[PDB]
Design a protein around this ligand. Sequence first.
Ligand code: 4OL
Ligand code: CF
Ligand code: CL
Length: 173
Amino acid sequence: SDLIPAPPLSKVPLQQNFQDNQFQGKWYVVGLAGNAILREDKDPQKMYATIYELKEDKSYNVTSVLFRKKKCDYWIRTFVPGSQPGEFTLGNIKSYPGLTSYLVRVVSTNYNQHAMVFFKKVSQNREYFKITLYGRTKELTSELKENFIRFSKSLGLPENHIVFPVPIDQCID
Ligand SMILES: O=C(NCCCN(CCCCN(CCCNC(=O)c1cccc(=O)n1O)C(=O)c1cccc(=O)n1O)C(=O)c1cccc(=O)n1O)c1cccc(=O)n1O
Ligand SMILES: [Cf+3]
Ligand SMILES: [Cl-]
């Protein structure tokens, strides 16, 4: 395989004065961009949700809920606070096969409507990155959608690497 290079981290803003308590709760994935994200026209990606629960020790318990093969499935993982507020690493990284590196950075949010989060991982020696556009509801304005496209492009991703998952009612509500 070939891949679009991960951008340098200096091109990825960090949300100023991140407020971990305010960010918890359910977020819908209304946009998704990445070097392994690809528009499939015939089978469009379904919207999923991700729930952030802040723990006693200030890490997040993060649960994603998906509608796959007629059932809800739940992927749980831990985000451990990193170097600056709003950055995380993945907890228990040794329990993920082939995984050597994993970084999360909250790029911006207003907490009660929208967020943009950056992810970078190295698995089987390949460097993957993605940007997620989170919304407290399933719809978001054209202005936010365009802004996200603009941001995705600034990290080297073309239009065919950007997807807006289709809203669904099953599992995620
Ligand atoms: O390239 C990225 N993402 C787009 C492809 C997602 N996908 C297509 C859909 C898969 C369905 N699932 C996965 C849900 C279950 N979990 C996993 O099987 C998993 C295993 C090992 C490590 C890990 O971390 N996970 O999640 C999501 O829709 C889903 C929902 C919520 C959070 C989340 O993360 N995912 O993936 C891939 O499987 C894939 C294909 C090829 C390369 C690759 O890296 N991945 O992940 C990426 C770049 C940088 C950081 C990062 O976390 N990701 O995912
Ligand atoms: Cf992933
Ligand atoms: Cl996610």
